[PDB]
Amino acid sequence: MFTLKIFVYSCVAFFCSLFIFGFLSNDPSRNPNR
């Protein structure tokens, strides 16, 4: 049960980090008028 918690925590932290740092990578520049 603890290992499952570790797994899920790893996944959540992973995708959350990708989300946050992803949207910080100059997202307004990602448009067809650039």
Partner: protein, 344 residues
Amino acid sequence: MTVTLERRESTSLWERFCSWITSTENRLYIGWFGVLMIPCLLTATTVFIIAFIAAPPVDIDGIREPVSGSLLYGNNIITGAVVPTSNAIGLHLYPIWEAASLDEWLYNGGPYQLVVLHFLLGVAAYMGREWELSYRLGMRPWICVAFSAPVAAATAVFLIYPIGQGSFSDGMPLGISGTFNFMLVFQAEHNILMHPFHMAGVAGVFGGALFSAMHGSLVTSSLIRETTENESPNYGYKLGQEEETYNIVAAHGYFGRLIFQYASFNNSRALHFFLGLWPVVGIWLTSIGISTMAFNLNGLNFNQSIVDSQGRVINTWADIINRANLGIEVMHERNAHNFPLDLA
């Protein structure tokens, strides 16, 4: 130096990743909001399917009386559902790793909580995703607002109402019959029919269907002859063409003669704005109604409002609907109540 910082970062690995994520060349767009959406909706979907088919009965009202919701336990499509988590748990977070076993988890209704949370997350991310693709394709960004209405409804019945009532066991069951149950109990305890916001919602959906049928019939009526007899008139339109496929003036004229001249729209942009606006506002209001009734600000109460000179009550239709409400109230969850007032 203005608003947007127009600049790049030179074929880096992380930049390549960001490029692929935000790629508009993918068959299905996978933005950052999709980086949230895809795993959430996948987990939610897997657990939902598996549970809807093979999950053991769930003690929804915490009174040690498990309700059967899966197909392999005597349900059909109409009666099958994912039973809401136990009232003994309330609003406590109940992940699998907080249970002693998967069996316990299944008994207390963990699947429901998991599915609901993941679904709400993934659907919010779906909304954000609609915005995102709109931005990537150089569109106007207000489709996600329109979609914000249904998200609000889902959030109302799966999260806010459990919060106001103090238990996820009051959340809407993931199933047809369960949904009907939710509706009936809700009527008994909030008199939602007599709530003006629900009336607004009914106006939104009835009106939405009305305007859908109306717009559809009007445009279909004024289609320009581009096709042979007995052939599908749809073949008279080609994807990407610039020429309009119907006589807008003829439609406006018809509508103008149907009611009166100034009742009709001339601006198609205005018309479609209205088409988008009416049901979205309706649903917005109904969602708010479900949440605010989630904090027990119930529908209008006209029970015994009319009295005669002597002081005797003269019933109205509100009193009859109150009789039905009473029926549902006294009959629902027969073994759950120990005290005369239902405050939870």
